[PDB]
Amino acid sequence: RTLGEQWKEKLNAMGKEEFFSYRKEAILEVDRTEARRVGGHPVSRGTAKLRWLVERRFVQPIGKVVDLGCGRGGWSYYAATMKNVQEVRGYTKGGPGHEEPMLMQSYGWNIVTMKSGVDVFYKPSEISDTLLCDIGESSPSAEIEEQRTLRILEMVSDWLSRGPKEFCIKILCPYMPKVIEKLESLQRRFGGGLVRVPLSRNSNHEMYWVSGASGNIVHAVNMTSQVLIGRMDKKIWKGPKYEEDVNLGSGTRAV
Ligand SMILES: Nc1ncnc2c1ncn2[C@@H]1O[C@H](CSCC[C@H](N)C(=O)O)[C@@H](O)[C@H]1O
Ligand SMILES: [Cl-]
Numbered sequence: 001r002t003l004g005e006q007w008k009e010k011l012n013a014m015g016k017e018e019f020f021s022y023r024k025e026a027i028l029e030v031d032r033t034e035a036r037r038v039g040g041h042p043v044s045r046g047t048a049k050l051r052w053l054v055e056r057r058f059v060q061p062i063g064k065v066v067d068l069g070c071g072r073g074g075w076s077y078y079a080a081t082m083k084n085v086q087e088v089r090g091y092t093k094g095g096p097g098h099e100e101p102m103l104m105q106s107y108g109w110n111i112v113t114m115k116s117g118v119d120v121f122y123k124p125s126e127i128s129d130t131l132l133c134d135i136g137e138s139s140p141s142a143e144i145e146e147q148r149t150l151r152i153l154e155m156v157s158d159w160l161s162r163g164p165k166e167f168c169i170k171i172l173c174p175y176m177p178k179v180i181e182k183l184e185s186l187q188r189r190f191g192g193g194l195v196r197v198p199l200s201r202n203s204n205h206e207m208y209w210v211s212g213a214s215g216n217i218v219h220a221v222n223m224t225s226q227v228l229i230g231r232m233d234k235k236i237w238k239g240p241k242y243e244e245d246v247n248l249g250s251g252t253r254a255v
């Protein structure tokens with residue numbers, strides 16, 4: 001079995017307390033204690049991760065942006081603040097137990113449309129310039145997550161065949177053999193590479209297939225596996241490192 005599976009088995013074996021501590025050890029963490037009181041305060045902690053990728057040119061949203069699994073709309077409102085973005089369309093399932101789009105008046109809200117009650121697995125693909133997808137339901141089973149990840153990759157493939165040259169797709173479980181194989185074919189066809197965003201907690205192995213990255217998928221996945229494993233069983237927990245939360249400003253925008 002893979003290093004990923006080993007990390008997963010170990011994680012699952014962790015006690016409640018150990019787990020809580022491990023979760024944010026040496027990670028990058030936003031100060032959300034100000035976001036909780038529009039004043040350009042992002043909806044969620046997902047905003048910071050997209051900002052991390054874009055700041056480093058791993059993805060450059062442009063034109064018509066589609067955001068699959070938009071939830072409250074962190075990614076959708078962020079994309080609306082990008083210079084070359086003209087329209088942002090979000091889709092999310094909503095409903096009991098799930099996140100509803102939160103209406104904001106951060107900068108470019110006038111160009112953001114978010115539709116709830118949409119299961120994107122049954123939604124026919126449409127043309128976009130930039131495809132964002134942040135779907136992935138966790139499970140202690142690597143096997144279960146493998147199958148979910150593959151279902152999302154199959155769904156993402158259909159939108160990516162409509163011509164977006166910019167993309168950012170969450171890979172819930174990048175370390176399983178069948179996912180690794182599918183990523184390689186998808187990389188061959190559409191390019192990009194896998195990146196580990198350091199704001200992600202150590203309790204998950206999520207990586208982002210981003211169009212501005214490149215390189216050997218297996219190596220990148222294995223590197224993350226090892227870093228995550230190296231952070232377990234610490235003598236002293238030093239905690240997370242912080243950065244300022246994103247500014248989304250306010251008001252309508254011209255396009
Ligand atoms: N099949 C599906 N169709 C549409 N939305 C789904 C879905 N499966 C899961 N989701 C939704 O996808 C979301 C992913 S979390 C979205 C976070 C967002 N990027 C932000 O920054 O706010 C969850 O809110 C979940 O309800
Ligand atoms: Cl899922």
Ligand SMILES: [Cl-]
Binds near residue numbers: 199
């Ligand atoms: Cl996370």
Ligand SMILES: [Cl-]
Binds near residue numbers: 252253254
């Ligand atoms: Cl403007």
